Amino acid sequence: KTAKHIMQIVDKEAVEEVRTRREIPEIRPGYIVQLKVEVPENKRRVSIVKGIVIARRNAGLNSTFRIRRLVAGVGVESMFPLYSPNLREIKVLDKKRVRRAKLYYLRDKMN
Amino acid sequence: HLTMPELGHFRAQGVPLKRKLREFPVTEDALLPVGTELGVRHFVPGQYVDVTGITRGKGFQGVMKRWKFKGGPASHGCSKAHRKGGSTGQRDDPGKVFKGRKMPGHMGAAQRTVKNVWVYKIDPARNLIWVRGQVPGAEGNFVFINDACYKKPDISKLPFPTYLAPEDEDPSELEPLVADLGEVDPFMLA
Amino acid sequence: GVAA
Amino acid sequence: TKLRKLGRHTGHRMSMLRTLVSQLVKHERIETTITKAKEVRRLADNMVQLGKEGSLDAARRAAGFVRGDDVIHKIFTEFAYRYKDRTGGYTRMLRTRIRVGDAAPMAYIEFIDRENELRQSNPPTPQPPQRVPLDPWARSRLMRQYAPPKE
Amino acid sequence: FIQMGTVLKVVDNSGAKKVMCIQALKGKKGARLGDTIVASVKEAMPNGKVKKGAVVYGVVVRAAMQRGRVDGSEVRFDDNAVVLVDNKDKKTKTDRQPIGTRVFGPVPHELRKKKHLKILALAQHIA
Amino acid sequence: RSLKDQMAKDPTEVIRKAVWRMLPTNNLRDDRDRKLRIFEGNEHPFGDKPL
Amino acid sequence: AVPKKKVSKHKRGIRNGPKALKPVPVIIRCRSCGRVKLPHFFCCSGERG
RNA sequence: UUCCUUGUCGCAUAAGUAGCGACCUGCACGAAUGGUGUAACGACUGCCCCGCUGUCUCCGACAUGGACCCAGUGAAAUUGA
RNA sequence: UGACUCCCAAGAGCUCUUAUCGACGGAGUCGUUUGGCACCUCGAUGUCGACUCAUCACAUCCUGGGGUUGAAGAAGGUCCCAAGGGUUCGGUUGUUCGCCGAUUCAAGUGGUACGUGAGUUGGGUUUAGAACGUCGUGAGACAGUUCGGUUCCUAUCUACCGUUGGUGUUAAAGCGAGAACUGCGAGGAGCCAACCCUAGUACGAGAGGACUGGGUUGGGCCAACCUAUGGUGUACCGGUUGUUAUGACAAUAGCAGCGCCGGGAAGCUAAGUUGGUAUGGAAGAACUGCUGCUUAGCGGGAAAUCCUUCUCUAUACAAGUUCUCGGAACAGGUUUUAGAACAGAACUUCGAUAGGCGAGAGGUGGAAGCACCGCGAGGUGUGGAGCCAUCUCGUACUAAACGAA
Numbered sequence A: 001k002t003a004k005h006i007m008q009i010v011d012k013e014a015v016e017e018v019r020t021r022r023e024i025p026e027i028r029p030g031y032i033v034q035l036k037v038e039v040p041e042n043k044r045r046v047s048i049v050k051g052i053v054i055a056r057r058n059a060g061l062n063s064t065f066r067i068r069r070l071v072a073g074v075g076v077e078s079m080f081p082l083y084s085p086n087l088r089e090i091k092v093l094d095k096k097r098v099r100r101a102k103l104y105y106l107r108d109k110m111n
Numbered sequence B: 001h002l003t004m005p006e007l008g009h010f011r012a013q014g015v016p017l018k019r020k021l022r023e024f025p026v027t028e029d030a031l032l033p034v035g036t037e038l039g040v041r042h043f044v045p046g047q048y049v050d051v052t053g054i055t056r057g058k059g060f061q062g063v064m065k066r067w068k069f070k071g072g073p074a075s076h077g078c079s080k081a082h083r084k085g086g087s088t089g090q091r092d093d094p095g096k097v098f099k100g101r102k103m104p105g106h107m108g109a110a111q112r113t114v115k116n117v118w119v120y121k122i123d124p125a126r127n128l129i130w131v132r133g134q135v136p137g138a139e140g141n142f143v144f145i146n147d148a149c150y151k152k153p154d155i156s157k158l159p160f161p162t163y164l165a166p167e168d169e170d171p172s173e174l175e176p177l178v179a180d181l182g183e184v185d186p187f188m189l190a
Numbered sequence C: 001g002v003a004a
Numbered sequence D: 001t002k003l004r005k006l007g008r009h010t011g012h013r014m015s016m017l018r019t020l021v022s023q024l025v026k027h028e029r030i031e032t033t034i035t036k037a038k039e040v041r042r043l044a045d046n047m048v049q050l051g052k053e054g055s056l057d058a059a060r061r062a063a064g065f066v067r068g069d070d071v072i073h074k075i076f077t078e079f080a081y082r083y084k085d086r087t088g089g090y091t092r093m094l095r096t097r098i099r100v101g102d103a104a105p106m107a108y109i110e111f112i113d114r115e116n117e118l119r120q121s122n123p124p125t126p127q128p129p130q131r132v133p134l135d136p137w138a139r140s141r142l143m144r145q146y147a148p149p150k151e
Numbered sequence E: 001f002i003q004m005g006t007v008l009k010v011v012d013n014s015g016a017k018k019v020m021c022i023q024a025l026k027g028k029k030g031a032r033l034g035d036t037i038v039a040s041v042k043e044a045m046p047n048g049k050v051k052k053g054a055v056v057y058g059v060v061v062r063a064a065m066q067r068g069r070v071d072g073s074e075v076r077f078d079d080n081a082v083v084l085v086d087n088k089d090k091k092t093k094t095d096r097q098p099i100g101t102r103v104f105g106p107v108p109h110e111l112r113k114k115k116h117l118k119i120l121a122l123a124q125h126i127a
Numbered sequence F: 001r002s003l004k005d006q007m008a009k010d011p012t013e014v015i016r017k018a019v020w021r022m023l024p025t026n027n028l029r030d031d032r033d034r035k036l037r038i039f040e041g042n043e044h045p046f047g048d049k050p051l
Numbered sequence G: 001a002v003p004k005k006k007v008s009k010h011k012r013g014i015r016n017g018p019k020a021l022k023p024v025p026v027i028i029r030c031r032s033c034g035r036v037k038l039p040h041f042f043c044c045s046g047e048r049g
Numbered sequence H: 001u002u003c004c005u006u007g008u009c010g011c012a013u014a015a016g017u018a019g020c021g022a023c024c025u026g027c028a029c030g031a032a033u034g035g036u037g038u039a040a041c042g043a044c045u046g047c048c049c050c051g052c053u054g055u056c057u058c059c060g061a062c063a064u065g066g067a068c069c070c071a072g073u074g075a076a077a078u079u080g081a
Numbered sequence I: 001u002g003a004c005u006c007c008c009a010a011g012a013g014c015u016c017u018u019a020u021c022g023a024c025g026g027a028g029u030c031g032u033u034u035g036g037c038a039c040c041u042c043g044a045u046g047u048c049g050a051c052u053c054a055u056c057a058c059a060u061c062c063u064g065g066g067g068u069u070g071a072a073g074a075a076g077g078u079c080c081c082a083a084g085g086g087u088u089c090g091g092u093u094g095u096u097c098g099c100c101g102a103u104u105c106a107a108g109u110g111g112u113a114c115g116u117g118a119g120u121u122g123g124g125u126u127u128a129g130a131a132c133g134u135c136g137u138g139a140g141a142c143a144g145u146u147c148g149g150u151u152c153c154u155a156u157c158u159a160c161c162g163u164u165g166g167u168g169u170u171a172a173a174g175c176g177a178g179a180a181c182u183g184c185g186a187g188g189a190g191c192c193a194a195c196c197c198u199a200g201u202a203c204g205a206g207a208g209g210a211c212u213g214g215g216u217u218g219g220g221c222c223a224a225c226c227u228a229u230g231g232u233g234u235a236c237c238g239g240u241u242g243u244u245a246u247g248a249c250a251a252u253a254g255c256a257g258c259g260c261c262g263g264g265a266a267g268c269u270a271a272g273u274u275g276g277u278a279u280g281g282a283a284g285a286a287c288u289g290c291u292g293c294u295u296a297g298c299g300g301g302a303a304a305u306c307c308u309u310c311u312c313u314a315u316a317c318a319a320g321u322u323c324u325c326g327g328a329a330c331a332g333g334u335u336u337u338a339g340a341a342c343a344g345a346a347c348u349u350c351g352a353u354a355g356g357c358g359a360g361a362g363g364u365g366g367a368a369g370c371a372c373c374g375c376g377a378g379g380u381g382u383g384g385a386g387c388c389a390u391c392u393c394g395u396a397c398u399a400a401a402c403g404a405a
């Protein structure tokens, strides 16, 4: 019990420390987002990713979210840690109405 | 919480009552008097340590979980021998089962040591240490940390026999120390 | 032959 | 919480628990096996909490669990008046004997703070408000102590 | 995992359109994204550099199994797709010449680490 | 293990093994083995006994 | 599989040795109702119940 | 129905002692102990393709009944010591 | 008979017997081939191949160290030393064997009842049915072909894998217990490839192309972990079909063996993530050199041997050491990170061990009631609403010493 309490204190402090340095908006399923992603494996290459949020998970500093987009005719799904420092800029463009929290039916739905 | 012999042992040694005890072999020049308080600054960030603990228990387990056996097929006629071990020896010379034969039994909850595990960060205000990777044991249990034998640390940098903290010290002014990674970027020289 |  | 299976599948287990809680409310004290009582006490406290809330949604949620009209009326009037100032723990479970026939350890389970109860219970005390806890390190600094002088 | 019996789409102009995988070059369970596979041509264009029935090499540029990165990100496509390279010179176990001249669709970031630099150069969309 | 390594490691075990396999094989063997005290040097504790 | 030989009285007694019963260390009796019981067993509640 | 024999050639496969079509050198086919075909039919015996899948790569989690433990009742083959 | 080794050396190798080979002839070793005998078993020793699980020998397939070459370098040939670790996936075939395809550092040869059916299978052979070819007057026959055809057993003893209970180890209370150790001894781990620098250097006419030394990335194997990812998540959240009940509305409950769909925290798990695949010392195999002068002494020397790193171990009977207690240790109850029972570990009232209660995190996705729009199915607001499988914190209300025991 004391160990889990220590872990929760550590996670709260890490999240609060990141939030005073970067501006990270609230991301929900059904949102349209556009973000700037730097890949350190490919010589720190910076690109722009635009998509629709189909899944989200709140896990403290290790919160995650999923993006499904169509690139060159082919659908690509990418998952990003929310507080990852390689997310330079995050913007929200549109908020589509959904009745689910996970939108995995978009893989088989034609549009 | 303690039985009477342990209460007497602590009262005779003149130390406050503790929960877990361990004994570490040292040399003659590395002894410390009774009552010395040891901190996280005993270790330097950037070095490698060895962690020893009691691993997680799995209970009575079979051969396919214990020793990664293959077992038998799930179809094609096999009858009541899907996850069993198969043969346990040859016939008549030797006429016996050899010692050390792999068989089902109690799994885990034994003591294991993880070598060359890296000290990333040190928080001396709270006496916390961030060590990269996994450590054997359950959460809420005790582990024992020594120096690594494989990647031996630098002699001139370790505090000997330990880090003697000044008595005029306050936890308000202590900032957590991160292990230095250098300056040359790994991801750019690729 | 032989058969069990 | 460890949830017991009691040798039954889901529908049989939940129907037996609902019948047991209804009989406990109806008779105010029942004798059953210790393992059944250890599962009954949680739901028997949950129904009393629903009756203490006493809203329409609580009435619907309690009528979706217990059986009988005497039971639902008793929970929503008499127990709401009786356990109004008590925080939790409305039931008392005491081991009594060993059953002839299968050596099952048996136990009384009853509602507390009434006439003809097994023990005189403590008076209902309001809980003090929430206190901001100390850090584990600040508590470990205060937890240090020496052996008492007797030897 | 891409293994024996996988059918993969071909995304260059080498003249073949579908291949059947034989094995992966390195790895026991199969091929992940960016890995090199040996395949046999199951269907091909009437005019092209590769005919039906040939044994070819390929580099997996799209795979339906998710792949993790060093920051904790994952990437997952929808189908499996390879770009064929030459195998007549078996002395080079490094970056190969692609057979074709154009690469269609998205290409992953792993090719720099796997040293598929010519495929990465001939790529157009990298995702 | 060779005799050279045995003499480098522990020399009294050589004499103990030599005597043990000339003693008869029965239940008195360890009782008679308990009376054989072998010393590497020339100093022994039994100085006050009638040697 | 069948037993190869008959189990003798010596082996039967050695097997049944550790399974014999043992006495109970603590026994409580209520002074009013006179019931002999183990610890943590409820028999009587006192007066003015 | 062919021992030599995984005969030789073609189709098909990355690779086919299998399968299909040929050839004739038929150890040891052959015309009501019927010869050659044949639409429909077959829980008959082979071969190939699509869809589908824990059959497999490579196994994992969960759920009911035994196995485990306590209280009653209480067998079996076997047995020179 | 077979396999392997050795002796002689006509001859081949431009010259040159013995780098590589070797005619005519001989001497052996092994117990794997084909055989010989009929000694055990016919009041039963279940026979081929496959699966699972292995283990030994070395006459070595790869990796390691060397001598010689008809060895410039690279790639080799042959012989000696070496058993530490390995030795692939598929097509036809019942196949062993073998052929083929794609790989690999390599895809070794044999023994263990041609290992292994009270561990699995049952395709072949080898019962009874039926057919073809051939033989026989015929009943029938054919290591000629083809289709079909019951695989039993609850483990007493030895062996092995795990877990416990008793007991010897004088002590001074006929002494009884709690911790912390040392390690006689035993077990485990032992791999390899590609690329880059040294270096386009050595060598070589050129084409080609190193030894040694140091990094990087992968594959195989082994030990652990659950932060994140994925799977499951049967007393969580929602949607919905058939029917029955609460008279109907409203809201629910049972059953369709989670009714069926979409998500799901903890826990478990790999398909995920980490850690190893070392260092130092001693003695030394083939080989290699030094002193001496016939006997020898000495130095260098491998993935091999023994200590060192990891795990167990004082029933280690020469039975070990240190600290402590004497209403001590146990037992009983509430539990758990532990678990078949047992054992371990936490708490046992001057107490947060479990339940309840309150607050928060997390999951689901917008409750009921009311109001507005629409004829209606329905839509919008109050409102990130309502609910609860888990996790944390606060709190003795209930059960643990309510033991005036």
Ligand SMILES: O=C(N[C@H](CO)[C@H](O)c1ccc([N+](=O)[O-])cc1)C(Cl)Cl
Residues within 6 Å of the ligand: C001, C002, C003, C004, I044, I045, I046, I047
């Ligand atoms: O007769 C049988 N076995 C005998 C003795 O039991 C013996 O084992 C045996 C086995 C196989 C065999 N054969 O394959 O020709 C001959 C005898 C079996 Cl039929 Cl049980």
Ligand SMILES: [K+]
Residues within 6 Å of the ligand: H001, H028, I133
């Ligand atoms: K014929």
Ligand SMILES: [K+]
Residues within 6 Å of the ligand: none
């Ligand atoms: K006819």
Ligand SMILES: [K+]
Residues within 6 Å of the ligand: H042, H044
């Ligand atoms: K039929």
Ligand SMILES: [K+]
Residues within 6 Å of the ligand: I041, I042
């Ligand atoms: K016989």
Ligand SMILES: [K+]
Residues within 6 Å of the ligand: none
């Ligand atoms: K070699």
Ligand SMILES: [K+]
Residues within 6 Å of the ligand: none
């Ligand atoms: K050589």
Ligand SMILES: [K+]
Residues within 6 Å of the ligand: I117
């Ligand atoms: K068998």
Ligand SMILES: [K+]
Residues within 6 Å of the ligand: I118
């Ligand atoms: K047998």
Ligand SMILES: [K+]
Residues within 6 Å of the ligand: I157, I158
């Ligand atoms: K025996």
Ligand SMILES: [K+]
Residues within 6 Å of the ligand: none
């Ligand atoms: K999970």
Ligand SMILES: [K+]
Residues within 6 Å of the ligand: none
């Ligand atoms: K439901």
Ligand SMILES: [K+]
Residues within 6 Å of the ligand: none
């Ligand atoms: K039914």
Ligand SMILES: [Mg+2]
Residues within 6 Å of the ligand: B070
């Ligand atoms: Mg397998």
Ligand SMILES: [Mg+2]
Residues within 6 Å of the ligand: B070, B071, B072, B073, B074
């Ligand atoms: Mg399997």
Ligand SMILES: [Mg+2]
Residues within 6 Å of the ligand: B078, B079, B080
């Ligand atoms: Mg089955």
